Nucleic acid binder design. Structure first.
Lengths: 74, 38, 556, 61
RNA sequence: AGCCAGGAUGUUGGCUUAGAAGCAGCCAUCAUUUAAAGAAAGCGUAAUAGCUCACUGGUCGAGUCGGCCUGCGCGGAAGA
């Protein structure tokens, strides 16, 4: 799998987009943009539902290609 | 290096040595744990 | 020429840090001791110089073997850059064509005029080497007034008629005043750059930048400090005008019905803030004057007349900036200033709630006298933005306070409202009420009621065991990525309260709320904690709980 | 001693001002007025007529 | 004991919604994947990431480890 490139335990509530102030360095301490994160968030998380506090896997590659795989609200 | 008249182990890296009869605590990690006779 | 000098290290840093796409059209000949010249990468030749220093005469040489392999390498990469934003010369490289030396000399010149890449040259000014080659590049690769497009601007009217500042000697007169510095022996030497047009020494010009109309005294040119007078003010040049008043720093001068091509540039922030105290207030007048002519010529320097403490505040850009400024005063302007510190904005507030405190005022002794007796309910009001810092409500129901006295009693409270007996500071957030009272006929005047409530105010105030409130001033900063915690802890130590932090483009923006009193000279500290790669802004946010220890300390 | 005629002021202990005579006839000791809009002083805010004195500019209207 | 190994999922588990995410504490102090692993002993963090350890696999080849009771010693321990 992917070793220490960017792995952080996050996304409490998948009911909001553009998590600029609240999240920021939460995963931004390492290598990720905010505006594209939520645009990436729109890509798959609005199909399950918007509002629920869903947890997701943050996967990032040094090739500057960040993506995720969703789960069910804990 | 402290000259506390009663030496003790502060962490894992802390260890006792009986050089010269003088009790000595040496820390392989924290040089603040380095004190002399007690 | 110094120990540890690596040329190539720079041509990487300029990318790794600044990303300038370096094109080292120069490359040295040797290390600390071994530096013996450079290799000219436009003719693929190298230069050797004369005896250690004095740069007597150039020794026209070739590439020594020890670097021949390398010079050819960077060269093919140099000429690889000879055509990267131009298809015509691209096929020249695509077909590997031997492009004309003098030609490719200008190919990059287009790119530098396009402001993409920069000449990277090496030399030891202390050893006189590398300098000459650099000076040649200043010509063979640098622009001229006509090499830059005539800047677009405005005229003076609404549509502004976007114009161009042609350096042609037939374009209407135009020039901007970039520097302001009064000479001692001569006068108010003002500097300016001739943009368009010309004139002889002395013309009446319309300073459309501020809507002014001035003249021109002598038109002198400053070699370094020697006065060189000129008559024809040739387009595209620079010189120093003399004998003007209205021309503030950064102003364009244009007389021939040719309004300004104005642009504004000066907008830094007077981050550093201190206070200063002249000895013998007579020295204060001249200080007011000296600072006046001083603080006007230099732009980023500000002065305030504190509306709270009436303190003469210096506002500057950096640690040294203020240091030299005051250094100037005593020395060349004759001004002894004692550097003080900013005052505060403490506010008195009642902690608890009073219940019945009454204020009586009776002094008869015969003749005419005064009488008054009221009660109030001073309550800690919500420290809201309601302009009624104190909220007061009439509460006499039986008609025992004749209408006349209301304005009187409230003034009594409001007069003492800005004295804050606890520490002399103003008062805030007060839910005062007027629940009961009692008036004596004729002997009771408006006067006694101003007093009585004021004294009444006091006991309830003293029964509320008041607390102070410092001003809390919002703060936002910027530190790349590596000083994150180090900056925060610093802020945390300052008795600040952290309130949020974000990661962006290349910086970490942090939002915190810290007492202003602890910001005495914060800026310098941050620059130290961040290699000077950090800065902030800070502005009023609110008045908040004073610190207990300092509360007993701040007391005079 | 000087009298700041007009309406209010904005002066405190430093302001360099220009002085002219004219006893107030009311506050004894005073023998002088302070020219509004002079060298450190602000001309009164909203003084429509008789605005020459008080250094109140001609209204923008 | 050293030498090669590992040391997991829900799980960011609430709240004082700044945030204390195994590592400030309160609360609980679970159940599963289980050669083993505590929802944690310590270093590292605004809050994370990070580095190890308990426990456990093998190697290796024999004793090893923690308190209690006392004998006699060392340090504590510098004056004209």
């Amino acid at each position: 799998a992917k070793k220490v490139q960017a792995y952080v335990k996050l996304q409490v509530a998948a009911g909001m987009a553009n998590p600029s102030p609240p999240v920021g360095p939460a995963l931004g301490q390492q290598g990720v943009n905010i505006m594209e994160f939520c645009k990436a968030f729109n890509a798959k998380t609005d199909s399950i539902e918007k509002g629920l506090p869903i947890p997701v896997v943050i996967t990032v590659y040094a090739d500057r290609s960040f993506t995720f795989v969703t789960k069910t609200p804990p | 290096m402290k000259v506390r008249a009663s030496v003790k182990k502060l962490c894992r890296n802390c260890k006792i040595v009986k050089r010269d009869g003088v009790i000595r605590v040496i820390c392989s990690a924290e040089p603040k744990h380095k004190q002399r006779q007690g | 020429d110094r120990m540890g000098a690596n040329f190539l290290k720079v041509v990487n840093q300029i990318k790794t840090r600044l990303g300038a796409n370096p094109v080292p059209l120069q490359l040295a000949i040797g290390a600390e001791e071994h530096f013996t010249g450079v290799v000219d990468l436009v003719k693929m030749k190298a230069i050797n110089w004369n005896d250690a220093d004095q740069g007597v005469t150039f020794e026209y040489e070739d590439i020594p073997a020890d670097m021949v392999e390398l010079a050819n390498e960077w060269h093919q990469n140099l000429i690889e850059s000879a055509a990267e934003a131009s298809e015509e010369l691209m096929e020249k490289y695509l077909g590997g064509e031997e492009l004309t030396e003098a030609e490719i000399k200008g190919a990059l010149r287009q790119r530098v005029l396009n402001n993409e890449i920069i000449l990277v040259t090496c030399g030891s000014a202390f050893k006189n080497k590398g300098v000459q080659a650099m000076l040649d590049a200043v010509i063979d690769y640098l622009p001229s007034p006509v090499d830059v497009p005539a800047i677009n601007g405005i005229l003076d009217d609404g549509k502004d008629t976007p114009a161009e500042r042609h350096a042609s000697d037939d374009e209407p007169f135009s020039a901007l005043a970039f520097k302001i510095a009064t000479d001692p022996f001569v006068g108010n030497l003002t500097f300016f750059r001739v943009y368009s047009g010309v004139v002889n020494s002395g013309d009446t010009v319309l300073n459309s930048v501020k809507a002014a109309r001035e003249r021109f005294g002598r038109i002198v040119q400053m070699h370094a400090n020697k006065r060189e007078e000129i008559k024809e003010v040739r387009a595209g040049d620079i010189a120093a005008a003399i004998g003007l008043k209205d021309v503030t720093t950064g102003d364009t001068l244009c007389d021939p019905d040719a309004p300004i091509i104005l642009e504004r540039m000066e907008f830094p922030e007077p981050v550093i803030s201190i206070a200063v105290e002249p000895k013998t207030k007579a020295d204060q007048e001249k200080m007011g004057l000296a600072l006046g002519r001083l603080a006007k010529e230099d732009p980023s320097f500000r002065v305030w007349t504190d509306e709270e403490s009436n303190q003469t505040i210096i506002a500057g850009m950096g640690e040294l900036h203020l240091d030299i400024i005051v250094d100037r005063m005593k020395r060349e302007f004759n001004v002894e200033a004692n550097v003080g510190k900013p005052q505060v904005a403490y506010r008195e507030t009642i902690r608890q709630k009073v219940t019945d405190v009454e204020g009586k005022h009776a002094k008869q002794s015969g003749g005419r006298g005064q009488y008054g007796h009221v009660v109030i309910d001073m309550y800690p009001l919500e420290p809201g933005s309601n302009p009624k810092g104190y909220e007061f409500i009439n509460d006499i129901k039986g008609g025992v306070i004749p209408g006349e006295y209301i304005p009187a009693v409230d003034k009594g409270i409001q007069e003492q409202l800005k004295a804050g007996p606890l520490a002399g500071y103003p008062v805030v957030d007060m839910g005062i009420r007027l629940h009961f009272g009692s008036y004596h006929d004729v002997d009771s005047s408006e006067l006694a009621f101003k007093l009585a409530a004021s004294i009444a105010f006091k006991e309830g105030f003293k029964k509320a065991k008041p607390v102070l409130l410092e001003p809390i001033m919002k703060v936002e900063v910027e530190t790349p990525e590596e000083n994150t915690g180090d900056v925060i802890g610093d802020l945390s130590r300052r008795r600040g309260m952290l309130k949020g932090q974000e990661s962006e483009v290349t910086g970490v923006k942090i939002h915190a709320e810290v007492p202003l009193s602890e910001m005495f000279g914060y800026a310098t500290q941050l620059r130290s904690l961040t290699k000077g790669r950090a800065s902030y802004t800070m502005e009023f946010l609110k008045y908040d709980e004073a610190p207990s220890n300092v509360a007993q300390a701040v007391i005079e | 001693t000087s009298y700041i005629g007009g309406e209010g002021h904005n002066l405190q202990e430093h302001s360099v001002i220009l002085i002219r005579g004219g006893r107030v006839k009311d506050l004894p000791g005073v023998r002088y007025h302070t020219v509004r809009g002079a060298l450190d002083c602000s001309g009164v805010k909203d003084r429509k007529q008789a605005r020459s004195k008080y250094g109140v500019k001609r209204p923008k209207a």
